[PDB]
Amino acid sequence: QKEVEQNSGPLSVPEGAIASLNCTYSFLGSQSFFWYRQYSGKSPELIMFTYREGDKEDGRFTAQLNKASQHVSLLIRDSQPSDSATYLCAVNDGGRLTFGDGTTLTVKPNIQNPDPAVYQLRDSKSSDKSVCLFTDFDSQTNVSQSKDSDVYITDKCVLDMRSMDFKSNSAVAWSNKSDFACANAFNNSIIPEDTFFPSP
Amino acid sequence: SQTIHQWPATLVQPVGSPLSLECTVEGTSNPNLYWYRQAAGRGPQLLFYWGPFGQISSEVPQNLSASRPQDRQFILSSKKLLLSDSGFYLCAWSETGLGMGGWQFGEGSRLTVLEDLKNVFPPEVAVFEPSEAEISHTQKATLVCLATGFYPDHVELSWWVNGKEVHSGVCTDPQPLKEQPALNDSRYALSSRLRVSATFWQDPRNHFRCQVQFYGLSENDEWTQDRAKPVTQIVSAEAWGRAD
């Protein structure tokens, strides 16, 4: 796709910061401009559209358009974890919308009272696997994947939309190996020195 | 108001089979109608754009056709699917009437075209009870659900507590991970967590269920293997609280 380009790497900001998405279009006679948001596994949702140069502000979002340089931007203020998505730019010419390839944005939640800990859950009798949960760490912690291809680790999950409870970070690691213990599950990840490891 | 709906949401079909995607819009007349196709990590590509002044089509050769049997019905078809047709299809509309309007997409259609239907596996589902160490240190109890060994990669996981679906305290992977990264046709896995208060977990009357909807084969698909036809189904696992 060359008529509409979003040539940017993946973006990331902490909760509450400002993020900015860029887009360039090729036809100067283009009439209107759009920003969509798209979550994993869903169709894109319309955020805003604009047809006038300058700024169009709507809540925490501002669409900026310069028809001389042919640039469109979306400014997101006071970013929220729920703003984490792929953002798409689209341009309308005679009714034909042309989309860019998108740019990902991740907004890290602010964990006010961290309590990094690694726990061992137990199967409900019908599996054979054992599961380890690394939870309550603050967002400045990155969970790497395991070197052992027989141990699986899911770094980050997405808080359900209708969730009324706060969000905390967690990673799950599992394996069917006898020598698999939670004490080493996350050895390839850099975890806080103060991580709580209960001793069974 | 105006809305737009498309179906089926997710399809799993064998190569050489026919395709038929539906799209309807409500609340407007003489709308512009569009079909797009979107690849992973890319933006939607225009397949068809129909309106009052004609049909506009993608410059790249497609194995698809569009039809409009009614003002507000748009259909995407194929007489014979190719492996290369797998993707995420999107229907959209825009107002032709005075002023702007619309530019909204339907929910989308996830199409997975398979060369061999014996590669399809429903998920195994297991629930893991909270750690007593978590309960002590935090007064919270996190249950974990693991859906493993399925193919293709689309399932929908929900948690149910005492007959009602819950959303609070639920965190689910946005997409499944490959159990065999280096292998092409790898099966998949998905995890979720449900965190509740220690006090709630410790009542043995409380009944928790992890439920996973899997989309696979339909009744008309042929099947002769011993294992159960891997049809579209729900697989779940459950747990009850414990006093300890």
| Chain B residues whose beta carbon lies within 8 Å of the beta carbon of residue A102 | 41-43
User: How many Cα neighbours within 13 Å face the side chain of B148?
Assistant: 16
Q: Same structural domain for residues B122 and B220?
A: yes
Q: Containing domain of residue B158, as a range? A: 116-241
Determine the Cα–Cα distance for residues A131 and A116; give it in Å rounded to an integer: 17
Q: How many domains does chain B have?
A: 2
Mutate to test the interface with B, among A115, A154, A196 (most CBs of B within 10 A): A154
CB A104 within 8 A of CB A85: yes
Residue ranges with strand state E in chain B? 3-7, 10-14, 19-26, 32-38, 45-51, 54-57, 65-70, 73-78, 87-94, 102-105, 109-114, 124-129, 140-150, 155-161, 164-166, 170-172, 177-178, 188-197, 207-214, 233-240
Q: Same structural domain for residues B120 and B224?
A: yes
Write the residue in A115, A124, A159 that is nearest to B128 by C-beta: A124
Determine the Cα–Cα distance for residues B52 and B50; give it in Å rounded to an integer: 7
Query: How close, in Å, is residue B225 to chain A by CA atoms?
Result: 24
Q: What's the longest Cα–Cα distance across chain B?
A: 72
Write the residue in B51, B154, B171 that is nearest to A159 by C-beta: B171
Cross-chain residue pair B94–A121, CB shorter than 8 Å: no
Q: Same structural domain for residues B128 and B39?
A: no
Q: Same structural domain for residues A18 and A81?
A: yes
Q: Same structural domain for residues B110 and B127?
A: no
CB B146 within 8 A of CB B212: no
From B137, B114, B122, select the one nearest B12 (Cα to Cα): B114
CATH of the domain at A199: 2.60.40.10
A125, with CB counted inside 10 A (0-12, 13-18, 19+), is exposed
Query: How close, in Å, is residue A69 to chain B by CA atoms?
Result: 23
Q: Containing domain of residue A166, as a range? A: 110-200
Cross-chain residue pair B142–A127, CB shorter than 8 Å: no
Q: How many domains does chain A have?
A: 2
CATH of the domain at B69: 2.60.40.10
Q: Same structural domain for residues B125 and B150?
A: yes
Q: Same structural domain for residues A103 and A134?
A: no
Mutate to test the interface with A, among B171, B186, B192, B197 (most CBs of A within 10 A): B171
- Residue B119: phi, psi to the nearest 5? -80, -10
Q: Same structural domain for residues A77 and A119?
A: no
Cross-chain residue pair A158–B174, CB shorter than 8 Å: yes
Determine the Cα–Cα distance for residues B188 and B45; give it in Å rounded to an integer: 27
Select from A109, A144, A169 the last residue of a domain. A109
Q: Same structural domain for residues B105 and B185?
A: no
Cross-chain residue pair B237–A160, CB shorter than 8 Å: no
Q: For residues B190-228, b (16+ Cβ closer than 10 Å) or e, as one string?
A: bbbbbbbebeebbeeebebbbbbbbbbbeeebeeeeeee
Write the residue in A96, A115, A163 that is nearest to B46 by C-beta: A96
Write the residue in B43, B131, B237 that is nearest to A100 by C-beta: B43
From A47, A51, A48, A76, select the one nearest A61 (Cα to Cα): A76
Q: Same structural domain for residues A100 and A4?
A: yes
Select from B71, B99, B115 the last residue of a domain. B115
Q: How far is CA A15 from the centre of its chain?
A: 12
Q: Same structural domain for residues B34 and B24?
A: yes
Amino acid at position A43, single letter: S
Select from B115, B135, B160 the last residue of a domain. B115
Closest chain A CA to residue B196: A165
Select from A76, A109, A142 the last residue of a domain. A109
- Is the omega angle on the peptide bond into residue B14 within 30 degrees of 0, that is, cis? no
Q: Same structural domain for residues A148 and A186?
A: yes
Cross-chain residue pair A124–B105, CB shorter than 8 Å: no
- Residue B138: phi, psi to the nearest 5? -130, -20
Q: Same structural domain for residues A104 and A115?
A: no
Select from A41, A75, A109 the last residue of a domain. A109
CA distances from A134 to A118, A159, A191, B172 (A): 4, 16, 9, 15
Q: Same structural domain for residues B154 and B92?
A: no
Q: Same structural domain for residues B228 and B120?
A: yes
Q: Same structural domain for residues A105 and A120?
A: no
Q: After which residues is chain A discontinuous, taking C to N > 2.5 Å?
A: none
Determine the Cα–Cα distance for residues A18 and A37; give it in Å rounded to an integer: 16
Determine the Cα–Cα distance for residues A172 and A182; give it in Å rounded to an integer: 10
Write the residue in B51, B105, B192 that is nearest to A157 by C-beta: B192
Select from B74, B92, B115 the last residue of a domain. B115
Residue count of chain B:
244
User: How many Cα neighbours within 13 Å face the side chain of A192?
Assistant: 17
- Residue B223: phi, psi to the nearest 5? -165, 130
Q: Same structural domain for residues B215 and B228?
A: yes
Q: Same structural domain for residues B170 and B206?
A: yes
